Paper text:
In this study, we present cryo-EM structures of GLIC reconstituted in lipid nanodiscs at pH 7.5, 5.5, 4.0, and 2.5. We identified a resting-like state, two putative intermediate states, a putative pre-open state, and an open state.
Two cryo-EM structures of GLIC reconstituted in either soybean polar lipid extract (or asolectin referred to as “aso” onwards) or DOPE:POPS:POPC (2:1:1) at pH 7.5 were obtained with a nominal resolution of 3.4 and 2.9 Å, respectively. Local resolution estimation of these two maps (referred here onwards as GLICaso-pH7.5 and GLICpH7.5) in the apo state shows higher resolution in TMD than ECD. The highest constriction is observed at I9´ with a radius of ~2.24 Å. Truncated phospholipids (PC in GLICaso-pH7.5 and PE in other structures) were placed in partially resolved non-protein lipid-like densities. In GLICaso-pH7.5, the head group of Lipid 1 is involved in polar interaction with the backbone amide group of M252 located at the M2–M3 loop and this interaction is not observed in GLICpH7.5 and GLICpH5.5. Therefore, our GLICpH7.5 and GLICaso-pH7.5 represent a state closer to the resting conformation.
Numbering used by the authors:
A (entry chain C), B (entry chain D), C (entry chain E), D (entry chain A), E (entry chain B): 5 to 317
Amino acid sequence: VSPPPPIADEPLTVNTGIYLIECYSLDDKAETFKVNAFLSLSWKDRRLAFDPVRSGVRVKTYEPEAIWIPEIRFVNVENARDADVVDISVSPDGTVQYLERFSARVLSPLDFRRYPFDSQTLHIYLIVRSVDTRNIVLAVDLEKVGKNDDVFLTGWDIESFTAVVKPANFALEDRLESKLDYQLRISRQYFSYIPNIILPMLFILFISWTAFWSTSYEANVTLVVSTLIAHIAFNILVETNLPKTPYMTYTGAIIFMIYLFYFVAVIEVTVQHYLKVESQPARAASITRASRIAFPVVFLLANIILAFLFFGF
Amino acid sequence: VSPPPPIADEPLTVNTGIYLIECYSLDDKAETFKVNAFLSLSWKDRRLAFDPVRSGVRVKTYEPEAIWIPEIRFVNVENARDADVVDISVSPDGTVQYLERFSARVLSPLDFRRYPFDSQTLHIYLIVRSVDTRNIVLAVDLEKVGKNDDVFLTGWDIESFTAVVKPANFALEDRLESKLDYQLRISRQYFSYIPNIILPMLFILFISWTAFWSTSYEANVTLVVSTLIAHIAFNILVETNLPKTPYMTYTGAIIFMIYLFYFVAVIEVTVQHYLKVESQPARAASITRASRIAFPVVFLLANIILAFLFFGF
Amino acid sequence: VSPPPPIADEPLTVNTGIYLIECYSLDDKAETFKVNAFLSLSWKDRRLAFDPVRSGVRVKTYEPEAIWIPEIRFVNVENARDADVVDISVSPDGTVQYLERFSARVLSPLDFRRYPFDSQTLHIYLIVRSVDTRNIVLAVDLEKVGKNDDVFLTGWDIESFTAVVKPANFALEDRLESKLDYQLRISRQYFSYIPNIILPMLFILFISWTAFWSTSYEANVTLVVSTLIAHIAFNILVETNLPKTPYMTYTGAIIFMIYLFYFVAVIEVTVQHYLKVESQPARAASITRASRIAFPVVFLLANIILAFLFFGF
Amino acid sequence: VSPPPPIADEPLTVNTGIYLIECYSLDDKAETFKVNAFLSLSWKDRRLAFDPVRSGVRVKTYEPEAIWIPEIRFVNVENARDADVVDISVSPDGTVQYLERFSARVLSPLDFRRYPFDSQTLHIYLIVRSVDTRNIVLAVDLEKVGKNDDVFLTGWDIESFTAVVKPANFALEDRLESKLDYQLRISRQYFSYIPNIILPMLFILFISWTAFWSTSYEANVTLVVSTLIAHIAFNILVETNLPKTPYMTYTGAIIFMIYLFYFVAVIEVTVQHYLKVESQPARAASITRASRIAFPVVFLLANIILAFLFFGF
Amino acid sequence: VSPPPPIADEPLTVNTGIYLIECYSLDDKAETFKVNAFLSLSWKDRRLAFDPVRSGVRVKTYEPEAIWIPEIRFVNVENARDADVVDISVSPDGTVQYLERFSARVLSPLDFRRYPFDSQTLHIYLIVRSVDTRNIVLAVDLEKVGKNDDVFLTGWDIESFTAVVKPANFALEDRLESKLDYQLRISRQYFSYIPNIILPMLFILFISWTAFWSTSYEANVTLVVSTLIAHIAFNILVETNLPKTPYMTYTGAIIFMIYLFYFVAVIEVTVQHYLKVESQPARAASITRASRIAFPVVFLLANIILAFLFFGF
């Protein structure tokens, strides 16, 4: 139970990789998801006398966990990973293929700035426990990293898992911490939201806009205010799906725009009624005719501007 | 505590089966349910010297857990199953009937594509721990698999449990993993939903449709918009029972159809009022008479089309 | 730590009883409640040499838990009961009075078919661990079963605890399992629900019924539809108290009846307006006068029929 | 590890007291709160040879937990208290001052019968573990009981903690159980509820009452029914703060009174409209003038009666 | 495992400091947040013979946890901190640099008196375990206290962590307890709340205020009451973001002011209608013209007064 002696006086290259098995239950509210995968490391200790016999009659040698194993810890996870050791084998004067089955509650933030069509990346970092004087450096093994076993999570389509970048950070000016980064690139399927969150609100707004084709003040007032109440009720209904973040959101500005449009519609209706009362029917009709075309065009232009602001640039 | 020597050089056939005892609390939101059942395996080790005495005076021999027992693990469950060993007996040069009482929080997905009348299947897979060189293959024992002990869960009617299929999958190109599949086929009782989720919404829509039999613009506007608000409030009320999935749902399209019908009704009322104002009473009456028959017929045809789309084909 | 030898070759009669101490927190949604009580068994082993000295100078002998104690397990509970041994004493060639203080989360179903005035029964079953060949049969000791220590739970009034029935069931055609049943008969106090769930809804319906004493179509429409919206809002407000079950409920049919009455009222108002427009004032007045008396009488008759259906028969 | 011999043949007086340190998070819904305090017992064993040396050179003697310590258990708490032993010292032929730091989730019921201005008392009972034949009786030590260390909990003002009563109860006719009662007397601060739960509802009711100063039937109907809907919505809004109990509540009857007032207002408006239609303007005006004064006076009288009923008597 | 002998007869100065690493998930409702940081103490024991060899060939000496380590406990946290020892080294006749990686659920109250623009301070206290007679006094080490490693939490901007004050409190008149205070000064970003909680309510109120520019009593009543209902619905919608405290809140008085304004608007509309009915059109017009200017000016003045009350003074 000791690190191999530094005869070469060089850090041991503990190559590692993760083969995803089954991931599910991505909770947006808690920013948590489950991960089940393989952990395959290939740390080599030839000078530790870990059976470097060089005997062909005893190839594929098997050893228990009595020898020291480089401990790997996940910074993201808040609980200890349930480890299940599978294979502990070393070749004659070769490397050790030590595999494990693990499940953990890995933590990762989310970016709800493009909520209907967002493209978050899922992060997993791991660290090594540097003990004694033998430096331990983590490398990337491209052979045993991937997810090609038909894994799926509802609402998303996986596209990449082999980012395998190594952003060696710093902490209290420490010597070295590799902190291998495993990026799980995912995208959201948006077809279930168009007829659920967007179209019902647009229909309510369009129902509101019909007040310009009438001349009854009571009917216009009832239409507009009851439509506003219906919009508030729908916003209450779809509160769970909508995200609540302390920053601006693309889906969080359309609602404010809708409120502004309701206020402007109320002001326009009141102005029309006042002008009609003050005996200016020609001016009232001109204002109504102008508004009929001004409202939807302004709405479309503002939506285009907001899309170009949040997306694109 | 060693696997039996492979004198025959063949994998040991560990026959197994599950006798359901009590299952309850199927939570649709978390896709979890409780299972209490028997686990009866019949693994045979004649060459392991596990009392193959062939003595009639000592039949029905009893042994403790000192001998090795093939460990069986459930991939679905997220926690260790509470095991209660009952019988450990071997016949002279026979097999071992090792029974257990277990309770676990087995996980399984659900398909909310036909929510009022869905027919989900409940999955349970188990795996064996291949140790040393003696291959372990899992088989199906039809004698001790079933649920015929008057087990019930509220809202469902069980119909089948003996699917006992063996879909041997692959993981990292491993040698063999039987992964026996235990399918619990269930169906939902829908009579408690017709007078709770469907009829109250249809009644609200029918109340909305009565606006075509009136000529008061203010009354029509109040009727339609307040009916829309009532529909939104009812949707809020029945949110818990309705499922929220990232895919299309049969019960998730009727609501969108209802919103579309409300929008079309508002447009029709506005058109009628505008035509009446513009001194076209004959055209207004013709439009109203046409709409009176066009609305329910179109609704019925669209419902039939949606039913033929989601169900049937 | 061995069962007493079957010198008489008869099963040992382990008499037992439960003296309730403090029960509280009956959660209807989770169908769970806390129970704190005494467990007093009187299993006798005279031939086990468990101090059958027959010495008057050493009466009321005290022994530790070194001797075997018949393990008692509760099938209902999902967790191990926190056991606190109090007295372990045997009389000379007598029985052992082994008492314990236990608290457990015992599970039991509920019948929400008469929710305002329901009379559920609370079930507790226990089983014995049959070991070796000495058969163990559970009996009922009427001396130490009861709750006469001023125990109360909010909202209910206890009436019986000494049902002490023994419904010996079967499981995989086993030899014997006594499975003593302890029925806790309780009833619900309904005076806090009449002015909270029933009267506010009846008042809303009565407010709706006043539309028949008016001739303004706009006023009638506003009254009826806004009353329907208020009823929906109240149903949302009292959702937590109301039960959600996959079967028919007495309180679950009155709501459907109320929706039907709202729909019929809307139809009647529309018919009256149409007849008045079509120049049939006498027929409109006759219809209104008939409806004024027909509505409450039909409502009362339907309520009586529903009461006779759910209750009584 | 044995109780002191009863040379005097008298029960040992284990004086005890609790010095509150920090209490917080009183959850009304779960009836739970956190308590951190000191536990100082002064049980004396002179005849147990627990260092009764009577040597002045070794005063303030220190001993470890090797000697037996009378176990103290809290019936209210559902979990074991995290104990932190601080001082274990005995004077020469004196007593033992054994102090501890403990934190527990102590349970206690609440009385929501005067919710805005309630004065609940917070209960803590403790019991002793009577072992062997040496009787253990719990007493009260007024020296080390109190809370004078500037402890506060939000929304309440503590007024008393030294009730230190000893209601020795009975359980299965046991010999003796002191069951010391520690009453924490608290009161609620009500100034944050007057402008949050009471005044907004009174304002809504007053808005409703303005219908008597108008003659438009449609306006009166809209006013009253929309005000009722607003009241229901506010009740939904303040549901969390309001308590839900299976008994009558002072704040639970004002709401029913408000519903009754809404119903009576609707009836009065309908009666006025019917009388005006039936050509009785003088009677309609007289009824309106009478109601204008009858409504607020009756409301005030009923509120006074309800206050005198729930409070006072 | 003994404290160093007090040869100097002076308390040992155990200097300590916390270097923040990663803090996140500040839950306002539960007043909890996660903290991951370094714990670096520099307690010195030269007279304890903890390798005071004064040998230059063995500088940077390494020792295991066999020697006693001063236990540090956090009063705020409700759970034991997960400790990970990193470095245990002593210089020849020097001090011990004992570092640890810890994560804990530290508790701290919040002041929701300026909720949109609040400036809470986050508190962390630690205590030492005084054992034997060697007094232990906690000091502050400014070298290893800070957060300069690019740590961020959503919605807040950290500004200070090195308060490192030492408010030595008292408990039962104890000798000494340093109770070092670590203040984490944070501020809230308010730009995400202006277009989400404030502007939508101001727009609703402004929509309400348009009733003064009309003469239709029915239209005015519908406008005002439906606007009030919409305001209640919005308050329900934004309930989660708003804080619920038993004391007055800046955001908790604006709502009451809005309710008062709605009530006054209803009263004004009723007064105008009554005066118009009683044939006083000049007085009605004068009242309307006065109110048009009186309402917004009074609202602005009251808002300024409330701001000067809660903020500033």
